[PDB]
Ligand binder design. Structure first.
Ligand code: NDP
Ligand code: SF4
Ligand code: SF4
Ligand code: ZN
Lengths: 95, 114, 208, 111, 176, 75, 126, 311, 95, 376
């Protein structure tokens, strides 16, 4: 912006990237500071009459660790389903 | 309470190991005091070595004697290497006093303390 | 319920339940506790004589691959007859799974140095040697990592205080750095932050 | 083929027959194991079931498909590792009773 | 979903192999690299000019550790020690006495600018917004003694500007 | 011109936004980028330091200090 | 593997490397902290605290701060039993004193005992 | 006494000692090691400097957080010295330049300085004023230097009579003056028979800090002599033998050569090192300390290659 | 309004002023003992004590969360002008 | 030394410019974070996880807050989740571009340093306008994002997205078929897959050699089910190809930012529970319960159920592990950090078996070791 056009031609002749259009010298793109202030919404809370904390008590639903052994068999289980093999890309994979 | 051992089955191999480590620390001191370019006579160094061995005189458990031997052999690894510095080997010496007394009287004038 | 509360899973819960009972069935010599939390990560609690058998079984056997390793920090706990907890954290590659192997130990009895079965275990084992002092028999290399050389005392124990005993400064009397006993310029005011009135009712141990 | 997907790994020209003789040696070394350990039961069950997956598949890519744990040579290396633990598990007799007690009040957390 | 790299091969056509040879000889795309660098050469640079053209900031920035007061009023702090109770390196030393009326106050309110770490937790914890982060960041002290602020240093620091801090909080009170 | 010549680098007078007690001047350009919007010109002998040379930060009054760090758009 | 085992207690007081002044002179106290009196509720019971003694804390001449020549006064150790407290004190080496866990004495009370005919317990105001 | 002068706790790194020191000089050698032992001792050290602030930055990290403090002074005013000793427990007079400038002779330094500071110190109500000086101060000739220090001792015993005048003999240390003068002989040596008895600097300042913390120190002048008492030619043999530089024996005033060829005599009229109760260390190991500069990689590392007798 | 100290120096708003045997006087060499002229006692007294003819009033100090939280104070006694704990100022009632 | 990226003692016991042994003596940056977090509470010891890593300033915070919330059974509302995803990708972008930059400094290559640090100055401007921090935004409390993003910020993110896509195409223009940089680094740091497993490497290494593993695509620790991307895989290994994997993770991070700006719902900031996060200001001034929860929450810290838990995120290094052990308390009993930088430091011997010292420099610089995190 506001540079002589022959040196801009030497810029885009030095590298074919169209250096003028996206040049990373941002002039006035950032909006005006001290904006209109926001009225912050509040989500699923202080809706009256059913905000019993016993319902959404994630602190009092921690459970102690359940135990198995201490100090005709369709079995030999794995810890998980065997994980499905992935799939190639779409937008220009190789190949 | 049969604890699994470290190296030995009684204290005799522990005595053998600690005297072998003392042999090694005897022959390794003048190499260091020639190598780190210190300012200390050799006999002063050897005598503080045997003082640091005599500091732990009351130790009787075999695992613990083995673990002291492992500590001393690790530091002799660090002094056959030059991985340590001049500061650490002078820090084994106690030369910047610290002249802190042992009498009751001087600990009374400089007090709030037994 | 639906908002603000993390919805627990059941598929991985039942699967790790069955898998823990599977391991408990197939190695009865070295199983003491199998346990599952509410968020379903497996814990297997182990006497320290079958550490190498359990690890050689868990890296292999093809019912559970478990290639990848994470640290074993023996979290420093008094009041127990055997103090420390070696905590393996195994992370598989074919299964997307997380198991933990808590074997126990104490201050002098060595454990069998898992470096020979996991090459990753070497610097973690040297770290736990330098910071706690659990000596590792049948091990190639035990140096001290992440401390000073001339320092000792194994500072992560509960017995070692928050600030150290030694303190380094410079002096021109011997033109070098020397060590001194510690002198703090401010007390570090500890805060009593332990509320009464039974913060969680489910976790009451049976009283004496 | 060409371009196996891993670095320090390259398939041989005969996957099938190497895989079969691997699993028959697994059945052998497992046959030396005593009967009462259910370890033998689980290993023999899953190994013969995986062999039976292999038996009816003269297609390389289809055997990669139906058998879980792809692609091909990871199964081979994993079976080699299973032979290594079987050779270790001649020793260590992991169906014996427990070694001696914990301190009986240990694994309670909240201390 | 995955997109792996260097699935490529040297194509065996003659124009392909002679272009790879010409790139082997003249270092042609090396000259392309030179051209890219010259394209950033004739680009206008983006610096500031420090004593004259300062760099930008944000309305929520964390500065000074100053103190406010009421409209023609008392010191806004009431010695409730929440700032020390959230202070992570304990750089808030508070010793309190009530004054000669019955109203409650302080004696000693020291912030260790060394030991501070500029969380903002003492901004978020102060119940009346009495301690506020300033805007400016220019301390730059030739001694170690003169980065330990006492109470009157803090209040003379907070009386060096308030309209500043009033503007930043007034433009920022709804957010936090 | 000698003053602005040996000041640092600029000749870009032509906006002339404001001035303040202590006498100092504040300019704001539109044409440059994000980083050369606004600048200051320090007057001399504001506390008699021969402050033509060796200028400090925080010679600015605080209201223009908020203005010059680009927190608002207006003086 | 079937070693010495015999009545020889543990001696880590040369392993752990704490200096001898802090080994010998420090007299620890093992006790149960009672309820914080101005509060109520005894959830802060059930934990055997080991504390050390207290030593000098002087006026920092530059700030009036609390500066001490103590490394150890910030310690507190939470135990569960009394036996293991005694065991840890003997194992690590330093001196120690013991105090009991003085329970409340359970009394019998009644609102129907507040109200009576010929017993003098009578609040006369409820 | 005012509070917060009372001692507190284990000494070292902000333990408030019972002393607030005011040290004249301290930019050079002896005052620097004295400030070093006071900062280890943990006092509050007022020090004036009349010089560039780089040497006062040099002695900055010696004391603890804010325990030292600096000011400016001269040999020409009275307000600065009075402001120095406004609030001073103890005050020591170290001053003296080895060579005359074009403004300050060896006359009027030891006349204008100690009279002025002694007078304003006695009028300021200090305790335990300690003035240093040299041994073998004679009223007679052959040393402008030593006769001016003799007149200095006369003035400081004249006014404020319960002071403490301390003389050592010549001192050798980690940055010694005279052995570092024996450095310069290497590029060129003079040998005569004269006895000499050096003393190492850190036990000198140990005796100084014991005598500055302990009363009975006032009035009685003290003399600090090491245990050596040997000959000049043996010292020259010893230093060129420790340095391993080959030699053939035959910033400098002639007052320097008059000092090192005067004499060194004894005085049993006054106590010394161990009568005050401080250890004295011999020459040889500190010589191995201080001769590391001159060797240059030929016989750079050696300890016990040479012993030289006393007398 | 600062007072007069005996040492030719300034007092502070809290009476911690020096003595004639002090070392911090000689750490005040050539540099300002800083002090604020603004005193908290000497501004509150120069406020008009407001009069609100109700019984129990609110206090915020002005502005929404730009001041201290709500406090409801009593205005029954006439022997004492009713004082907010946060606002630092007094009140009365009329009738 | 500057090629010793950060501070790193390296005892190399070589044969002359063609080695014999390398010894990574680390520990010089040892600080005591684990001891300090024993003696504090959760909300207070959060900036130790700000300051543990010192490039990925937000993802490790995400890891710690996810450890606490996976312990505590709380799901934050989804606007906080999408903002957490957004800053995860932005900070991952910053970390990968510094990895490319400091490897360029080690290898020579003085200019992409300056270019991409102008871009990273724009990044720090974003952190300035978000949290009032230049480099260490706490900003991620257990309870989610605190003090949400202000008005007129998504404009800046959008403009940065477009310009940065152009700038990273220009970095591929600059390097990447540069003959001298390519043939400088081809066949160094070969890592077989067996060794890549058993040496405990994680993340960028395991992508960069062989195995097809991804923490994001295989374990949703966030709202990553709805976003669509693809992770690059290295297949030679050949450290050049690992570099290419880092470049394509950067451009895929731009894609995830594009989807995230498409799918931002205007829900909320914090959770619906004043016994976990402190309430806002109007409630803090009026409501009694808000004041009580505020005051007791900033004194004691909230009580926490007991548990020995672990989680891990996809750090720009890799499998970043955090292992909490929590007493029934408001204090963590022992936290622990598994650093992928430490794991990658472990295999330095096998990376430098048969090479020369410039290869040692390129191998230390080619994996994003930082040693503020490698130390624990
Ligand atoms: N054996 C003995 O008893 C001997 C003792 N000494 C004493 O040892 C101490 C250390 O020796 P040395 O290093 O040479 O001495 P000093 O470093 O103490 O030199 C005197 C100090 O006072 C300052 N000073 C000197 N002349 C003037 C003046 N005209 N006006 C103002 N300030 C002045 C100097 O300032 P600056 O350097 O900053 O310019 C210097 O810091 C001295 O006190 C000296 O008297 C010395 C020789 C023999
Ligand atoms: S939080 Fe605010 S009101 Fe409370 S003591 Fe601190 S500064 Fe004072
Ligand atoms: S910002 Fe500074 S003073 Fe405030 S709480 Fe944090 S460390 Fe403490
Ligand atoms: Zn009010």
């Amino acid at each position: 912006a506001s540079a002589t056009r022959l040196i801009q031609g030497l810029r885009n002749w030095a590298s074919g990237r169209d250096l003028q259009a996206k040049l990373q010298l941002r002039y006035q793109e950032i909006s005006k500071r001290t904006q209109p202030p926001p009225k912050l919404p509040v989500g699923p809370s202080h809706r009256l009459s059913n905000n019993y904390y016993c319902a959404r008590d994630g602190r009092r639903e921690a459970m102690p660790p359940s135990i198995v052994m201490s100090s005709s068999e369709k079995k030999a289980v794995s810890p998980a389903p065997p994980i499905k093999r992935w799939e190639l890309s779409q937008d220009e994979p190789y190949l | 309470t049969s604890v699994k051992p470290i190296f030995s089955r009684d204290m005799n191999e522990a005595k053998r190991r600690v005297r072998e480590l003392y042999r090694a620390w005897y022959r390794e001191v003048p190499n260091t005091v020639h190598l780190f370019q210190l300012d200390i006579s050799v006999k002063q160094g050897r005598d503080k070595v045997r003082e640091m061995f005599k500091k732990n005189a009351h130790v009787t458990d075999p695992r613990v004697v083995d673990l002291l031997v492992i500590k001393g052999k690790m530091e002799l690894e660090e002094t056959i290497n030059v991985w340590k510095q001049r500061t650490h080997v002078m820090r084994f010496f106690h030369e910047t006093e610290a002249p802190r007394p042992k009498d009751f009287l001087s600990k009374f004038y400089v007090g709030h303390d037994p | 319920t639906r908002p603000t509360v993390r919805p627990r899973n059941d598929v991985a819960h039942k699967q790790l339940s069955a898998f823990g009972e599977y391991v408990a069935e197939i190695l009865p010599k070295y199983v003491q506790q199998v346990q599952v939390s509410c968020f379903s990560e497996l814990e297997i609690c182990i006497h320290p004589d079958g550490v190498i058998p359990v690890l050689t079984f868990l890296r292999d056997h093809s019912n559970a691959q478990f290639k990848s390793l994470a640290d074993l920090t023996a979290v420093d706990i008094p009041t127990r007859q055997n103090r420390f907890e070696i905590v393996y954290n195994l992370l598989s590659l074919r299964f997307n799974s997380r198991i933990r192997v808590k074997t126990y130990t104490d201050e002098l009895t060595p454990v069998e140095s898992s470096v020979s079965v996991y090459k990753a275990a070497n610097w973690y084992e040297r770290e736990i040697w330098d910071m706690f002092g659990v000596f590792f028999a049948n091990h190639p290399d035990l140096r001290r990592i992440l401390t000073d050389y001339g320092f000792e005392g194994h500072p992560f124990r509960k017995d070692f205080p928050l600030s150290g005993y030694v303190e380094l400064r410079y002096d021109d009397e011997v033109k070098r750095v020397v060590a001194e006993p510690v002198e703090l310029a401010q007390e570090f005011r500890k805060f009593d932050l332990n509320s009464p009135w039974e913060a969680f009712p489910a976790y009451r141990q049976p009283p004496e | 083929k060409k371009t196996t997907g891993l670095v320090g790994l390259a398939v041989c020209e005969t996957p099938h027959e190497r895989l079969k003789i691997l699993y028959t040696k697994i059945l052998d070394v497992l046959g030396h194991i005593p009967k009462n350990a259910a370890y033998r039961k689980y290993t023999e069950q899953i190994t013969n079931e995986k062999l039976s997956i292999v038996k009816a598949e003269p297609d390389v890519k289809k055997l990669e498909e139906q058998l879980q744990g792809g692609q091909i040579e990871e199964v081979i290396l994993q079976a080699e590792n299973e032979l290594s633990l079987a050779r270790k598990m001649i020793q260590w007799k992991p169906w014996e009773p427990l070694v001696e007690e914990p301190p009986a009040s240990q694994w309670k957390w909240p201390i | 979903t995955y997109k792996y790299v260097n699935l490529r091969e040297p194509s065996m056509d003659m124009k392909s192999v002679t272009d790879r040879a010409a790139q082997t000889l003249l270092w042609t795309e090396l000259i392309r690299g030179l051209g890219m660098t010259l394209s950033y050469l004739f680009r206008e640079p983006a610096t500031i000019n420090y004593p004259f053209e300062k760099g930008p900031l944000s309305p929520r920035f964390r500065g000074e550790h100053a103190l406010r007061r009421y409209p023609s009023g008392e010191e806004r702090c009431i010695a409730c020690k929440l700032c020390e109770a959230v202070c992570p390196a304990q750089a808030i030393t508070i010793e309190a006495e009530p004054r000669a009326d019955g109203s409650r106050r302080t004696t000693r309110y020291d912030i260790d600018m060394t030991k501070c770490i500029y969380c903002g937790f003492c901004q978020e914890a102060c119940p009346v917004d009495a301690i506020v982060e300033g805007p400016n960041f220019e301390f730059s002290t030739e001694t170690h003694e003169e980065l330990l602020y006492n109470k009157e240093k803090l209040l003379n620091n907070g009386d060096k500007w308030e309209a500043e801090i009033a503007a930043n909080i007034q433009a920022d009170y709804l957010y936090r | 011109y000698l003053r602005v010549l040996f000041r640092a680098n600029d000749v870009r007078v032509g906006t002339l936004v404001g001035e303040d007690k202590y006498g100092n001047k504040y300019y704001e350009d539109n044409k440059q980028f994000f980083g050369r919007h606004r600048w200051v010109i320090y007057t001399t002998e504001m506390n008699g330091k021969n402050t033509f040379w060796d200028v400090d930060g925080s010679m600015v009054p605080p209201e223009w200090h908020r203005w010059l760090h680009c927190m608002t758009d207006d003086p | 593997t079937q070693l010495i085992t015999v009545d020889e207690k543990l001696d880590i007081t040369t392993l752990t490397g704490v200096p001898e002044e802090h080994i010998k002179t420090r007299k620890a106290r093992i006790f149960v902290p009672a309820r914080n009196n101005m509060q109520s509720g005894v959830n802060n019971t059930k934990k055997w605290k080991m504390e050390f003694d207290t030593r000098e804390r002087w006026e920092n001449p530059l700030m009036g701060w609390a500066s001490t020549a103590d490394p150890l006064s910030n310690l507190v150790l939470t135990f569960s039993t009394k036996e293991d407290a005694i065991a840890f004190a003997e194992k690590n080496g330093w001196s120690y004193d013991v105090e009991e866990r003085k329970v409340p004495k359970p009394k019998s009370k009644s609102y129907g005992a507040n109200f009576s005919w010929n017993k003098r317990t009578r609040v006369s105001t409820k | 006494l005012h509070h917060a002068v009372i001692p507190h706790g284990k000494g070292g790194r902000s333990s408030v000692s019972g002393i607030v020191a005011t040290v004249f000089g301290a930019t050079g050698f002896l005052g620097r090691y004295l400030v070093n032992h006071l900062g280890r001792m943990g006092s509050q050290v007022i020090v004036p400097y009349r010089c560039e602030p780089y040497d006062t930055m040099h002695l900055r990290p010696m004391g603890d957080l804010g325990q030292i403090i600096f000011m400016d002074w001269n040999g020409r005013d009275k307000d600065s010295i009075r402001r120095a000793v406004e609030h001073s427990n103890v005050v020591i007079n170290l001053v003296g330049r080895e060579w005359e400038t074009k403004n300050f002779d060896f006359e009027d330094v030891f006349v204008k300085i100690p009279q002025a500071i002694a007078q304003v110190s006695k009028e300021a109500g200090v305790e335990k004023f300690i003035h240093i000086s040299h041994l073998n101060a004679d009223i007679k000739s052959s040393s402008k230097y030593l006769r001016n220090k003799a007149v200095g001792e006369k003035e400081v015993r004249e006014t404020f009579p319960e002071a403490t005048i301390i003389k050592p003999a010549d001192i050798f240390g980690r940055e010694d003056r005279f052995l570092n003068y024996f450095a310069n002989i290497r590029w060129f040596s003079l040998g005569k028979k004269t006895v000499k008895q050096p003393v190492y600097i850190v036990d000198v300042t140990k005796g100084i800090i014991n005598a500055i913390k302990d009363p009975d120190a006032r009035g009685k002048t003290f003399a600090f002599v090491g245990p050596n008492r040997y000959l000049l030619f043996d010292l020259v043999q010893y230093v060129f033998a420790v340095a391993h530089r080959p030699f053939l024996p035959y910033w400098t005033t002639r007052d320097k050569v008059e000092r090192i060829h005067t004499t060194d005599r004894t005085l049993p009229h006054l106590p010394g090192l161990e009568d005050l109760g401080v250890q004295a260390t011999p020459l040889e190991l500190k010589a191995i300390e201080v001769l590391r500069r001159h060797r240059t990689y030929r016989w750079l590392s050696s300890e016990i290659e040479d012993v030289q007798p006393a007398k | 309004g600062v007072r007069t100290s005996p040492t030719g120096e300034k007092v502070t708003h809290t009476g911690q002023v020096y003595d004639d045997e002090d070392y911090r006087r000689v750490r005040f060499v050539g540099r300002q003992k800083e002090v604020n002229e603004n005193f908290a006692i000497d501004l509150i007294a120069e406020q008009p004590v407001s009069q609100v003819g109700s019984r129990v009033i609110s206090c915020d100090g002005g502005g929404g969360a730009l001041g201290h939280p709500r406090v409801y104070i009593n205005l029954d006694k006439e022997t004492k002008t009713g004082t907010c704990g946060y606002c630092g100022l007094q009140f009365r009632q009329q009738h | 030394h500057p090629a010793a990226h950060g501070v790193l003692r390296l005892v190399m016991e070589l044969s002359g410019e063609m080695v014999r042994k390398c010894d990574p003596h680390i520990g010089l940056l040892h600080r005591g974070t684990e001891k300090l977090i024993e003696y504090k509470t959760y909300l207070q010891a959060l900036p130790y996880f700000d300051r543990l890593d010192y490039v990925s300033m937000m993802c490790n915070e995400q890891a710690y807050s996810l450890a606490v919330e996976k312990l505590l059974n709380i799901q934050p509302p989804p606007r906080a989740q999408w903002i957490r995803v957004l800053f995860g990708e932005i900070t991952r972008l910053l970390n990968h571009i510094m990895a490319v930059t400091t490897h360029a400094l080690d290898i020579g290559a003085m200019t992409p340093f300056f270019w991409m640090f102008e871009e990273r100055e724009k990044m720090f401007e974003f952190y300035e306008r978000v949290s009032g921090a230049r480099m260490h935004a706490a900003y991620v409390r257990p309870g989610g994002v605190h003090q949400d993003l202000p008005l007129g910020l998504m404009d800046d993110i959008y403009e940065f997205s477009k310009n940065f896509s152009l700038r990273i195409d220009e970095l591929e223009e600059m390097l990447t078929n540069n003959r001298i940089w390519r043939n400088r680094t081809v066949d160094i740091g070969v890592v077989t897959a067996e060794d890549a497993l058993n040496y405990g490497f994680s993340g960028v290494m395991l992508r960069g050699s062989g195995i097809q593993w991804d923490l994001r695509k295989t374990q949703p620790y966030d709202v990553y089910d709805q976003v669509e991307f693809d992770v690059p895989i290295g297949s030679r290994g050949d450290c050049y190809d690992r570099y290419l994997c880092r470049v394509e993770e950067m451009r895929q991070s731009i894609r995830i930012i594009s989807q995230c700006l498409n799918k931002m719902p205007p829900g909320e900031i914090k959770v619906d529970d004043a016994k976990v996060s402190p309430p806002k200001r109007a409630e803090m001034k009026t409501s009694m319960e808000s004041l009580i929860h505020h005051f007791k929450l900033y004194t004691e810290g909230y009580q926490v159920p007991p548990g020995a838990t672990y989680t891990a995120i996809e750090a720009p290094k890799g499998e970043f592990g955090v292992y909490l052990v929590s007493d029934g308390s408001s204090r963590p009993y022992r936290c622990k950090i598994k650093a992928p930088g430490f794991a990658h430091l472990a295999g330095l011997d096998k990376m430098s078996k048969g090479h020369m010292l410039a290869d040692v420099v390129a191998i230390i610089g080619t994996q994003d070791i930082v040693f503020g995190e490698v130390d624990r």
